[PDB]
């Protein structure tokens, strides 16, 4: 079963970010392991002194933490040798990238032309990892909770219509209704992110134009015959933003929708960690309540082993979106698989 | 001097229509009489059309009247974020056109109804962008905080704490009145058991005549507006204190209108006639302003306030020495030509603040916590473009105001 | 704030037309004829219902959607049936099959694409939409089945517009079908799952209030339909008129629905005296309460006695005080603080309108929320694993292209539902 495996990194501030406001020293690192933290701002929290983003001092556990000099590379290191071993094992594996917005997920996930992300980087160790082999991807995204698939041809106007959820023999829920493409190589994987790109839906916001609109879902499903199966799936959450309150229109809708699914995930862990702790004949888990909680229910609750990624946002403003952020980490980190 | 008036949320529309009518009439101003300096803003046009179709439709500027066909929504939210939002720009234009058009003004005194959908939300974002726009100015809203067992909304708490979160930051002086309270009056000071929403707004309508209105006028104790904030509020907290009536007898049933000073003004600190489920259980008081109108002599006055400060019984805060605010205005209250109450020629106006509201915060705070537990309704407010964030943040917020009204006083 | 009214099935068709017979009434609007309304009020708000063409024909917005001709081919055929526009005619020749599957997959699939055509002409009609009345039958093709296409496709189109559900479930008693469990479960799968305001109807409910409340000897299906008929009015319509309290679908729903489920809702109608004799004319407000309030008089099977509630929702509409209204209702939640959950400080939310019904008064319009409705789901569920079991009339389904785990998926949601209900009702 053991502890989800959670690893906490930080971006560094960008040149534009620090000009607009310089407050560093919010993060500190103690041991590679832990976290310290001492955040600065404007103002503390008005109230008695306690829990303020003024000055204030807090302890942050997970198994890595990564510093803003190193990038994907690090990761790819640690995380992306022993996580693909697994799915070639034939183990379940699943991996997501949680923060709030500007954290630099699609960093982590995409990653840049000279810095390649998890994804790229683990589909080059699936190669030295890996008798009859059969291999397929899916890619879709979730936007205004509606699902697209990515593998669709590109045109004007294009629906692949909702996902089937519906659960089949097996009790674990199963995702329908996507087109799969067989994988000869990593360029043919890397093809289907490309196209997925324009597919997906993309906006800008104030904090950051790179910025998603929708989750993107990446599914690989491999199949052994020395048939084994087993199944990687890198998920690319979006995340929370501040940026509702500047911005208006379809992009308030957009992030309305994002901003209520990314808390039932945080309801159901909760739930889940509370499951830990008490026996029996205590609170169900939220799986029900939303579409995107039932399909990551396998990943929560069910098979397969998880890892998540966490990106932190050093800045201020960010620091109660963020705290949230760290605090879901810390309560998913209590239940085992 | 001036100062204009924000009517927002479905309660606070209804509420407006009839305190801006007991002005009209003690000023010769019939339906079709010059402007007012108000706004009236929700997102239910069925109510705000009701000023449009009921009395005193041609008696407002179609352009004080701003109406969201959307969705009302009975939650913050929605109201503050989403929908609201698209109201703001409008709104805010108005109430910048009509600020510059006047001659110095003094402030908006704004009126909303914390447990409601756009008395919640809109006034929120309405308060916040306008502390910015007009730091320089005061800011005193009439607000009618939630019954204490009498709600109506399910969710009625949550609105309140998330507005009580952005108010408190922003506002200077927000004066309450209890909704439920307000029937107890009607039944123990008028005997009436067919009390309607447009009655409980013509008690509001009255006291609110002798706030702004009546001392707007001229006469021999003069107060602007500044000295209320300043005098009734201790801390830069946009501390909450409670408005109360004295005059308050049934035109029908008892007949005693010749009631001396001395005892109009001692029927204010009585419990059962405070306008407020907030019963001096230990609220001590701390600042207090006594707002007559009509025949009072300032000797008269300045004898009836000493009696009281030697009653012991109405305990004042240690660090407070004196604090009492003698407003004497000229013209005598006005009742409604056949409405229900008596019209005498003296009224006692008499609002303070009171460390008595670490009761009905908490009372509120437990009614949100109870609920927060399990998140309930909360869902609603996430997928309208919010989060834990708003929540969290504003009941470890709030808190430090049931701490503050308990360490600022019950402490020598 | 328009709407758009659904007729699906034949039940849903049937109880449609009496709906319109009544709503009409409420508006002074005559079949063909213009707005002969007693008053002006029955028509500051008319658009919500109605479309805006010639001058004097104000066309209900609603579709009918069947695979069954004879009814569709009734309804247009006797009195305010020919108050519907032909493009809301939305027929289907077809096998129309008691058939969840032959409604949903077979022949409903066809029919749908034609639907969508025109669930889109009314959306865009005026004003801003607010959401989308759906009724129908959980115990046929047409109703369960179309109906349960209709919702997941309308709820993808526009899931920012609210979803109100009247369903017919089947009574315990006596079932009006033999597949009807099968037809329920299906339907009830996607509802839970799409629509956001649920109001289940019991054909044995109405006929026992129906019997015992009105001295009616025969009861009709014209008649138990227009009672029914007589409660969805005072939900929405009502709700869209003046008020010293107004509400609406949105506060409404924002007020009654704790947990995203959808959850079941009881309705309930006020003033339920008989006509002759009965006329006490008792409608004070205590009276009301004392009914509503009651076993007797809701509209599902199960007591709300056995079992908590959640929300509450008096929706008034007659001239009254409201100190002796939001007074009653907490009295109400402290003689019975048993049933009536505790970590809820204010279960009931008081709404107020002005303008009553026609010839009546005043009366109200109940809609409960108690976790009792349990005692519904469970009955269902059982019923149908019974005959599931031993596969009954699954062969029925698969043969219209079904799936075996697909009966299995249904169940296990109903049967979670279950759960959760019962996670608060303790
Ligand atoms: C002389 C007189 O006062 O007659 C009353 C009457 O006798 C009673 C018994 C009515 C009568 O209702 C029934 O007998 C009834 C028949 C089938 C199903 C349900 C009820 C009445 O038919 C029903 C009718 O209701 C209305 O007019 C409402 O506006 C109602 N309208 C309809 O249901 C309707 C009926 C036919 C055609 C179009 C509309 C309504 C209620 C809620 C929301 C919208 C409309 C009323 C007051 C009466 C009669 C005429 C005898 C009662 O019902 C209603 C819904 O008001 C039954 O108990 C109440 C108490 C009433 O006093
Ligand atoms: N005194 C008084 N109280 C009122 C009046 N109308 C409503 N209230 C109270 O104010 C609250 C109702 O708020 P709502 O009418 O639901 O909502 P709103 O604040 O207008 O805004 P929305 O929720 O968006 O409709 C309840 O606590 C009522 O008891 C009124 O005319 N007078
Ligand atoms: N109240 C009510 N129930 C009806 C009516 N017609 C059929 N029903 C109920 O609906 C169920 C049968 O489904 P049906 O409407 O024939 O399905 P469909 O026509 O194939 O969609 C039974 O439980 C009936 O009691 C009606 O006019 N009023
Ligand atoms: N570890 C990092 N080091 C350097 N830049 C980073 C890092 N993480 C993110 N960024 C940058 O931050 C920006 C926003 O990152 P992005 O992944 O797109 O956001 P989101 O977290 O919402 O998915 C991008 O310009 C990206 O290149
Ligand atoms: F790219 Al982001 F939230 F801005 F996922
Ligand atoms: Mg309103």
Request: hydrophobic share 35%.
């Amino acid at each position: 079963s053991e502890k989800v495996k959670v690893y906490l990194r930080i971006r560094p501030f960008l040149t534009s970010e620090l000009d607009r406001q310089e407050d560093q020293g919010c993060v500190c690192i103690e041991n590679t392991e832990t976290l310290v933290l001492q955040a600065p701002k404007d103002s503390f929290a008005l109230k008695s002194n306690e829990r303020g983003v003024g000055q204030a001092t807090h302890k942050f556990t997970f198994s890595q933490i990564f510093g803003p000099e190193v990038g994907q590379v690090a990761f790819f290191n640690l995380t992306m040798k022993e996580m693909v071993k697994d799915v070639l094992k034939g183990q379940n594996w699943l991996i997501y990238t949680y923060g709030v917005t500007n954290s630099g997920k699609t960093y982590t996930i995409q990653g840049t032309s000279k810095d390649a992300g998890i994804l790229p980087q683990s589909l080059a160790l699936i190669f030295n990892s890996l008798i009859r082999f059969s291999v397929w991807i899916s890619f879709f995204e979730i936007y205004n909770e509606l699902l697209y698939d990515l593998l669709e041809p590109p045109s004007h106007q294009h629906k692949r219509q909702t996902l089937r959820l519906c659960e089949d023999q097996n009790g674990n829920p199963y995702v329908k209704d996507l087109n799969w493409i067989h994988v000869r190589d990593v360029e043919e994987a890397w093809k289907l992110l490309k196209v997925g790109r324009k597919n997906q839906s993309f906006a800008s916001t104030h904090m950051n134009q790179q910025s998603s609109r929708s989750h993107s879902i990446f599914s690989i499903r491999i199949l052994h015959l020395q048939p084994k199966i087993s199944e990687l799936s890198l998920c690319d959450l979006a995340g929370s933003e501040r940026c509702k309150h500047q911005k208006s229109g379809e992009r308030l809708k957009e992030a309305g929708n994002i901003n209520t699914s990314l808390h039932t995930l945080g309801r159901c862990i909760a739930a889940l960690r509370q499951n830990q702790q008490n026996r029996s004949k205590q609170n169900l888990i939220p799986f029900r309540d939303s579409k995107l909680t039932r399909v990551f229910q396998g990943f929560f609750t069910g098979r397969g082993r998880s890892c998540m990624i966490v990106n932190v946002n050093p800045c201020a403003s960010t620091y109660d979106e963020t705290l949230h952020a760290a605090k879901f980490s810390a309560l998913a980190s209590q239940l085992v698989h | 001097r001036e100062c204009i008036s924000i009517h927002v949320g479905q309660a606070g529309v209804q509420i407006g229509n009839a305190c801006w009518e007991l002005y009209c009439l003690e000023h010769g101003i019939q339906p079709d009489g010059h402007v007012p300096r108000a706004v009236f803003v929700d997102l239910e046009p069925t109510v705000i059309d009701e000023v449009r179709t009921g009395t005193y439709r041609q008696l407002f500027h179609p352009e004080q009247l701003i109406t969201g066909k959307e969705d009302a929504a009975n939650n913050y939210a929605r109201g503050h974020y989403t929908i609201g939002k698209e109201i703001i720009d409008l709104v805010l234009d108005r109430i910048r056109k009509l600020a510059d058009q006047c001659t110095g003004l003094q402030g908006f005194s704004v009126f909303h109804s914390f447990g409601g959908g756009t008395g919640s939300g809109f006034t929120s974002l309405l308060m916040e962008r306008l502390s910015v726009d007009y730091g320089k100015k005061s800011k005193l809203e009439f607000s009618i905080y939630p019954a204490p067992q009498v709600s109506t909304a399910v969710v009625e708490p949550y609105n309140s704490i998330l507005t009580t979160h952005t108010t408190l930051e922003h506002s200077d002086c927000a004066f309450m009145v209890d909704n439920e309270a307000i029937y107890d009056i009607c039944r123990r000071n008028l005997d009436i058991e067919r009390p309607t929403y447009t009655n409980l707004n013509r008690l509001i309508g009255q006291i609110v005549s002798s706030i702004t209105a009546s001392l707007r006028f001229d006469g021999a104790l003069n107060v602007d507006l500044t000295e209320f904030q300043t005098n009734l509020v201790p801390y830069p907290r946009g501390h909450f204190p409670l408005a109360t009536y004295a005059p308050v007898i049934s035109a029908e049933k008892a007949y005693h209108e010749q009631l001396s000073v001395a005892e109009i003004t001692n029927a204010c600190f009585e419990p059962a006639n405070q306008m407020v489920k907030c019963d001096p259980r230990h609220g001590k008081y701390m600042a207090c302003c006594l707002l007559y109108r009509g025949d009072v002599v300032p000797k008269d006055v300045n004898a009836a306030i000493a009696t009281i400060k030697t009653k012991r019984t109405i305990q004042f805060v240690d660090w407070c020495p004196t604090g009492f605010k003698v407003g004497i205005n000229y013209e005598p209250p006005t009742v409604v030509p056949g409405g229900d109450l008596a019209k005498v020629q003296r009224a006692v106006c008499m609002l303070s603040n009171t460390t008595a509201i670490a009761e009905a915060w908490a009372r509120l705070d437990h009614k949100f916590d109870l609920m927060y537990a399990k998140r309930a309704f909360v869902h609603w407010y996430v997928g309208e473009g919010m989060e834990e964030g708003e929540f969290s943040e504003a009941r470890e917020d709030m808190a430090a105001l049931e701490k503050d009204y308990e360490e600022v006083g019950v402490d020598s | 704030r328009e709407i758009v009214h659904i007729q699906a099935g034949q039940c849903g068709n049937q109880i449609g037309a009496k709906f319109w017979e009544v709503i009409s009434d409420e508006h002074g609007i005559d079949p063909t004829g213009s707005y002969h309304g007693d008053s002006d009020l029955q028509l500051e708000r008319i658009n919500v219902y109605y479309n805006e063409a010639a001058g004097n024909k104000y066309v209900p917005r609603a579709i009918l959607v069947d695979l069954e001709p004879g009814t569709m081919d009734s309804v247009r055929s006797g009195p305010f049936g020919q108050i519907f526009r032909p493009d809301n005619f939305v027929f289907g020749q077809s096998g129309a099959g008691n058939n969840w599957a032959k409604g949903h997959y077979t022949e409903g699939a066809e029919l749908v694409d034609s639907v969508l055509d025109v669930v889109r002409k009314e959306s865009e009609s005026c004003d801003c939409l607010q959401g989308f009345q759906l009724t129908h039958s959980l115990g046929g093709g047409t109703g369960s089945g179309m109906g349960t296409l209709l919702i997941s496709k309308i709820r993808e189109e526009y899931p920012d517009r609210i979803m109100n559900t009247f369903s017919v479930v089947p009574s315990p008693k006596v079932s009006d079908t033999v597949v009807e469990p099968y037809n329920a479960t299906l339907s009830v799968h996607q509802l839970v799952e799409n629509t956001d305001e649920t109001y289940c109807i019991d054909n044995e409910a109405l006929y026992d209030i129906c019997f015992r409340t009105l001295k009616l000897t025969t009861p009709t299906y014209g008649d138990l339909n227009h009672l029914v008929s007589a409660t969805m009015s005072g939900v929405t319509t009502c709700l869209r008129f003046p008020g010293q309290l107004n509400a609406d679908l949105r506060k409404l729903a924002v007020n009654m629905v704790p947990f995203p489920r959808l959850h079941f809702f009881m309705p309930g109608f006020a003033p339920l005296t008989s006509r002759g004799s009965q006329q006490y004319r008792a409608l004070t407000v205590p009276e009301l309460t004392q009914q509503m309030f009651d076993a007797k008089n809701m509209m599902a099977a199960c007591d709300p006695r056995h079992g908590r509630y959640l929300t509450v929702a008096a929706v008034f509409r007659g001239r009254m005080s409201m100190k002796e209204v939001d007074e009653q209702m907490l009295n109400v939640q402290n003689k019975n603080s048993s049933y009536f959950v505790e970590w809820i400080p204010n279960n009931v939310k008081t709404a107020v309108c002005d303008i009553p019904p026609r010839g009546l008064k005043m009366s109200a319009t109940f809609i409960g929320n108690s976790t009792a409705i349990q005692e519904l789901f469970k009955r269902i569920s059982e019923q149908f694993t019974a005959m599931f079991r031993r596969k009954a009339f699954l062969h029925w389904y698969t043969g219209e292209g079904m799936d075996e785990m697909e009966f299995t998926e249904a169940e296990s949601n109903m049967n979670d539902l279950v759960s959760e209900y019962q996670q608060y009702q303790d």
